[PDB]
Amino acid sequence: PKPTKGPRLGGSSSHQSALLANLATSLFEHGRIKTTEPKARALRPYAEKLITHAKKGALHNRREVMKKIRDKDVVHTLFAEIGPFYADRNGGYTRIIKVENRKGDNAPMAVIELVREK
């Protein structure tokens, strides 16, 4: 993907990767998540790429997704349910909805969901 044009988010590339992986696994487990807008903006392409790798199920893809997210239960449920459900759709795997602003810091949030129309 395109690397962040400006300075990283958390204060280190390691923190970037770890936080992004944590958000990805949480999203896969739940389905709906609300957080700061920039985090969702950065996450969307990563989730799309992960689902792309998932779409064509095979041992190599299994190994890659495991290497990336590191959670056996999550990978199992992923390749058990999500994979086939997105068989006929090309691209456009996620949507982001803008939501109301915060009170403590006045920083906007946004909620992202998996497409479920079909």
């Binding site: 909805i97 803008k98 939501v99 109301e100 909620v111």
Partner: protein
């Protein structure tokens, strides 16, 4: 450094005036049978009911 003299009242007020805030625009949206005003930035959230309204 430091300032040398106390500026004039007129100068102070003139410089102060520009410091303010701007109001945002509103849009009419209908939910649950009544019309209430929300910013256009929250149209989809209001439609889907993901934003709480007092």
């Amino acid at each position: 450094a430091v300032p040398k003299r106390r500026m004039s009242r007129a100068n102070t007020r003139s410089r102060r005036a520009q410091w303010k805030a701007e109001a945002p625009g509103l849009v009419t949206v209908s939910v649950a049978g009544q019309q209430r005003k929300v910013p256009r930035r929250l149209l989809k959230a209001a439609r889907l009911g993901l934003v709480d309204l007092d």
